[PDB]
Amino acid sequence: GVVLRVVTVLEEPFVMVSENVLGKPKKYQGFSIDVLDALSNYLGFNYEIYVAPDHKYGSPTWNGLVGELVFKRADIGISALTITPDRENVVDFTTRYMDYSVGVLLRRSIQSLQDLSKQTDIPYGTVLDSAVYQHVRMKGLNPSMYSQMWRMINNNVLESQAGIQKVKYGNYAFVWDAAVLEYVAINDPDCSFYTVTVADRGYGIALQHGSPYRDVFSQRILELQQSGDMDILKHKWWPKNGQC
Amino acid sequence: VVLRVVTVLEEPFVMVSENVLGKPKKYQGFSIDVLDALSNYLGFNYEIYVAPDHKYGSPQEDGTWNGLVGELVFKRADIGISALTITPDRENVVDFTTRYMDYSVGVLLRRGTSIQSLQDLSKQTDIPYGTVLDSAVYQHVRMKGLNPFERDSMYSQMWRMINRSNGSENNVLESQAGIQKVKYGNYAFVWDAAVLEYVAINDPDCSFYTVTVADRGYGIALQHGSPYRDVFSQRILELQQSGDMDILKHKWWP
Ligand SMILES: [Ca+2]
Ligand SMILES: [Ca+2]
């Protein structure tokens, strides 16, 4: 079984450093890693993991993870990497292995992005100029809550843990990646958070443009999705089975 | 050049819009708009033709595919368009673009009832329900209702209703059959939500009303190793992320 280069980007609980002890090789865990193992175990290929030098997903030459692929320094790119047209142009993606959504972190009355966007008592924002910021903008100016969210968000934003922390010790809701948020919520030592749809796109696995693995990879991903296995894997990192 | 486009009639994905003496048929529909979007951007032209066997395609015991998927495997078509879902068995023999819309299972009911979900429909027996015998939905239901490793209470019920006599009681053998059974009798029809939705909307009497999540997606099938695969996905990604797709979607599902 040949060895493929896997480049990742830390993002809990998608890709995390599970082990890093002086004198030992770094080990990783997480939903994205599980999917890589499900594919490696079936297709019989092996691998070595390394993080994107800049800890960036990749923005237009290309930087970050996508860049590592465009410059053929990697073979696969496992991370909470969203499938977008620009990227799909420079690299090749599999099928989405999970749907990407925008969520809101609240502090222990709001129950939906709709309520969050009808009230003001609780200011709310995201990470300035980020993917989510642009998403709310783009939607907010279309031609019916997004418009009231943009009117609001567009002062109140910031740049990620800062937002997480705002909600914790102050009055503020944080709009951001829902899977990330949910994990943050579930695993909070004091259980001070609760989260609150739609899917504009999805998380993918990138391979270098014209890779011969894309096809069989997508097959295996679809099979894990349609068989119900993805869910067995999703519950491991996102279980509404207890704690908070 | 001109690309051969195969398809399967299905409302509102692909329908006949124009068919009048001494003229070539004209098709319309959500899937048709998407195809046009691709056609205009990549600037290619096509000629539409329907799946010889009116089926999306199943792996036949000869070791070859029939239906639409089959048209691509035998290189008779270049593009496959319709409410075709991206599935492992399929993607293994043909190349799919990224999904262009999500596929959810839904339920068609008759005005007067108050079933809020598949969960509810599952917890009552007063209104018998079902789907198409041996269809995709039939399988899914049987699969999740039979699984012992993870016993889904909902699907278990769903499953014992569907096969109440091995399928003779509540299953219809054609889409139209189940739809009409809801309207003229005591029956709930479990089918493709998008399809049932177009039917709910446009019912002349508004005697219908519909009600899950999605594990699949409808995709554009191309032939194994198609050169158009990558580029086709790029623009679908574009239409979705740029709210455009949502407009085409409000077109047939207002
Ligand atoms: Ca590409
Ligand atoms: Ca394929």
Instruction: List all residues 6 or more positions away from B166 whose beta carbon is below 8 Å from its beta carbon.
Output: none
Q: Under an 8 A CB cutoff, do B88 and A219 touch?
A: yes
CA distance B106 to A34: 31
Q: Are the C-beta atoms of residues A26 and A17 closer than 8 Å to each other?
A: yes
A73 closest CA partner among A60, A82, A64, A86: A64
Q: How far is CA B3 from CA A158, B44, B88, in A?
A: 50, 7, 25
Contact residues, chain A, for B96 at CB < 8 Å: 95, 218
- Return all residues near A114 (Cβ < 8 A) that are at least 6 apart: A145
- How far apart CA A85 and CA B237 sit, in angstroms, is 5
Query: HSE on the CB side for A169, CA within 13 Å?
Result: 3
Work out how many domains chain B is built from and give that number.
Answer: 2
Q: Is B110 left (phi over 0), alpha (psi -120 to 50) or beta?
A: beta
Other beta carbons less than 10 A from residue B24's beta carbon: 8
CA distance B160 to B32: 38
B215's tokens? 């594990």
One-letter-per-residue 3-state SS of B197-249: HHHHHCCCCCCEEECCCEEEEECCEEECCCCCHHHHHHHHHHHHHCCHHHHHH
Cα dihedral B165→B169→B174→B175 (10° resolution): -120
- DSSP assignment letter at B98: S
Contact assessment for residue B190 and residue B110, using Cβ atoms and an 8 Å cutoff: no
* B183 and B166 co-located in one domain: yes
CATH code for the domain in which residue B33 is found = 3.40.190.10
CA of A94 relative to ligand 1 center, distance in Å: 10
Contact between residue B77 and residue B86 where contact means Cβ atoms under 8 Å apart? no
Q: Enter the tokens of residue A242.
A: 């207890």
Q: Which residues pair with B218 in a beta bridge?
A: B85, B101
On whether the CB atoms of residues A127 and A175 are closer than 8 A, the answer is no
Q: Are residues B3 and B93 in the same domain?
A: yes
Q: Do the beta carbons of residue B216 and residue B31 sit within 8 Å?
A: no
A217/A205 Cα distance (integer angstroms): 9
Structure-block tokens of residue B243: 């709210």
Instruction: Round the CA-based radius of gyration of chain A to a whole number and report it.
Output: 19
DSSP string across B5-22: EEE--BTTTBEEEE--SS
Nearest CA to CA, how far is A57 from chain B (Å)?
Answer: 18
For the beta carbon of residue B202, count every other beta carbon within 10 angstroms. Answer: 13
Question: Same domain, yes or no, for B99 and B220?
Answer: yes
Which numbered ligand comes closest to the C-alpha of B227?
1
Q: Does A137 touch chain B (CB under 8 A)?
A: no
Give the integer Cα–Cα distance in Å for A212 and A231: 27
Q: For residue B254, what is the DSSP state?
A: -
Positive/negative CA dihedral, A81, A86, A90, A92: positive
What does the radius of gyration of chain B's CA atoms come to, in whole angstroms? 19
Q: How far is CA A61 from CA A65, A69, A204, B13, in A?
A: 12, 11, 21, 39
Name A70's Cβ contacts closer than 8 Å, sequence gap at least 6. A61, A62, A90, A91, A208, A209
Say if the Cβ atoms of B88 and A226 lie within 8 Å: yes
Resolution in A: 2.8
Claim to verify: residue B150 and residue B208 sit in the same structural domain: yes
Q: How far apart are CA A216 and CA A231, in angstroms?
A: 21
* Angle formed at CA A221 by CA B37 and CA B234, multiple of 5 degrees: 20
Q: What single-letter amino acid sits at B165? A: S
User: How many degrees, rounded to 5, is the angle at CA B186 between CA B185 and CA B189?
Assistant: 95
DSSP string, B114-181: ---SHHHHHT--SS-EE-BTTSHHHHHHHHHHH-STT--HHHHHHHHHHTTTSSTTT-BSSHHHHHHH
**Whether residues B47 and B121 fall in one domain:** no
Using DSSP bridges, classify how beta strands A76-82 and B94-96 pair: parallel, antiparallel or unpaired.
unpaired
Task: Read off the tokens for B186.
Answer: 């005591």
Q: Are residues A131 and A152 in the same domain?
A: yes
Same domain, A20 and A91: yes
Q: What is the residue range of A115's domain? A: 101-200
Verify that A96 and A205 share a domain, yes or no: yes
Return the closest-CA partner of residue A122 out of A173, A174, A194, A170: A173
Residue B191, CA distances (Å) to B78, B158, B172 in order: 29, 13, 11
DSSP notation for A154-201: ----B--HHHHHHHHHSS-EEEEEHHHHHHHHHT-TT--EEE----SE
Q: Are residues A2 and A93 in the same domain?
A: yes
Phi, then psi, of B176 in degrees rounded to 5: -40, -35
**Which residues in chain B are closer than 8 Å to A142, comparing Cβ atoms?**
243
DSSP string for B79-93 = EEESS-B--HHHHTT
Are A208 and A93 found together in one domain? yes
Tell me the C-alpha distance between A60 and B149, whole Å.
Answer: 45
Q: Same domain, yes or no, for B99 and B40?
A: yes
Residue type, A74: A
Can you count the helices (H) and strands (E) in chain A?
Answer: 10, 12
> Is residue A200 within 8 angstroms of chain B, CB to CB?
yes
**Strand locations in B8-63 (E):** 15-18, 26-28, 45-50, 59-60
Q: Count of A–B CB contacts within 8 Å?
A: 57
Which strand ranges, in their side-by-side order, compose the sheet holding A102-107? A124-125, A173-177, A102-107, A193-195
Q: How many Å separate Cα B69 from the centre of its chain?
A: 14
* Separation CA A10–CA A49 (nearest Å): 12
Q: A158-180: string of b/e by CB count within 10 Å (b at 16+)?
A: beeeebbebbbeeebbbbbbbbb
Minimal Cα distance from A224: which residue of B?
A: B88
Mind telling me how many Å the CA of A107 is from chain B's nearest CA? Answer: 27
Is some CB atom of chain A closer than 8 A to the CB atom of B99?
yes
Q: For residue A228, which residues of chain B lie inside 8 Å, CB to CB?
A: 144, 147, 150
User: How would you classify the pairing of strands B101-110 and B188-192?
Assistant: antiparallel
Peptide bond into B148 cis (omega under 30): no
- Conformational region of residue B72, where left means phi above 0, alpha means psi within -120 to 50, and beta covers everything else: alpha
Residues B70, B63: contact at Cβ < 8 Å? no
Distance from the first to the final alpha carbon of chain A: 42
B28 φψ region: left (φ > 0), alpha (ψ -120 to 50), beta (else): beta
Which ligand is nearest the CA of B96, by number?
A: 2
- In order, the DSSP letters of A29-45 are ESHHHHHHHHHHHHHT-
Beta bridge partners of B6: B49, B80
- Output b/e per residue, A181-219; b: 16+ Cβ within 10 A: bbbbbbebeeeebbbbeebbbbbbbbbbeebebbbbbbb
CA distance A105 to A193: 7
Query: Quick check: A200 and B98 in contact, CB under 8 A?
Result: no
Quote the tokens at residue A75: 């073979």
Contact A68, A7 (CB under 8 A): yes
Q: Looking at the CA of B69, which ligand is closest?
A: 2
- In this structure, are B210 and B237 located in the same domain? no
